[PDB]
Amino acid sequence: GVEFEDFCLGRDLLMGIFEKGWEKPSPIQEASIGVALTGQDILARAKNGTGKTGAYCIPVIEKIQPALKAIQAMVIVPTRELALQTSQICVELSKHIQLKVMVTTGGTDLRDDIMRLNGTVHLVIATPGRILDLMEKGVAKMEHCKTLVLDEADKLLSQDFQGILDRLINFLPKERQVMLYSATFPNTVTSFMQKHMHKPYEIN
């Protein structure tokens, strides 16, 4: 049976995993974590549960350098509810790392977010509209953001979002890892992945 120690995670992260009660990796975690740690793009068909979240949160947190005071990874979700669920898991998993997590879902005085970004932020969890606004204003600087997670990609690429995911991803460095998770794969998703991703590892 595959163990979390089999991935060679930092001890601080391992303690957060153990202390959250995750003794052994779930199927989607075992399927994805090892490849995700290599840096290869990831294309995963997954339903909108929460084992999905651990599957991408663990590798995202592992490769963040907390001594580097810059945004190094970003998770994009379609809703506030999902942003809060994902943020809770990241905060829990990174309990023993000095990792600064920022959540924004808009609906607030933009100065709340500007205030936070003037400080140290390692990991951004966001709905796409507000964080794109912060990127276009130059408040969220993306030079070091080498990892992007798109969670519920079919929703994020729907008509609702009016093409802003394409504007968002164009701010990221060209050398970067994209992890895409989605329940369905219509033309919006497949055309996006062909344009922006590089020979991703596919996961059923």
Binding site for its own copies (CB under 8 A): 6-8, 34-35, 37-40, 199, 201-202
What is the nearest approach in angstroms of its own copies to the Cβ of residue 82? 28
Q: Which residues of 12-50 are buried (b: 16+ CB within 10 A; e: fewer)?
A: bbbebbeeeebeebbebbbbbbbbbeeeebbbbebeeee
What is the nearest approach in angstroms of its own copies to the Cβ of residue 159? 32
Number of residues that this document lists for the chain: 204
* Enclosing H/E stretch for 30: helix 27-38
| 107 in a known ligand binding site | no
| 155 in a known ligand binding site | no
**Residue 39 or 51 with smaller CB distance to its own copies:** 39
Q: Which residues contact 88 (CB under 8 A, 6 or more apart)?
A: none
| 79 in a known ligand binding site | no
**Residue 14 or 132 with smaller CB distance to its own copies:** 14
What is the nearest approach in angstroms of its own copies to the Cβ of residue 35? 5
Residue 124 and residue 71: Cα distance in Å, rounded?
A: 7
Q: Which residues contact 201 (CB under 8 A, 6 or more apart)?
A: 35, 40, 41, 42, 43
**Residue 38 or 191 with smaller CB distance to its own copies:** 38
**Residue 45 or 167 with smaller CB distance to its own copies:** 45
What is the nearest approach in angstroms of its own copies to the Cβ of residue 37? 7
Residues at the annotated binding site for ATP?
46-53
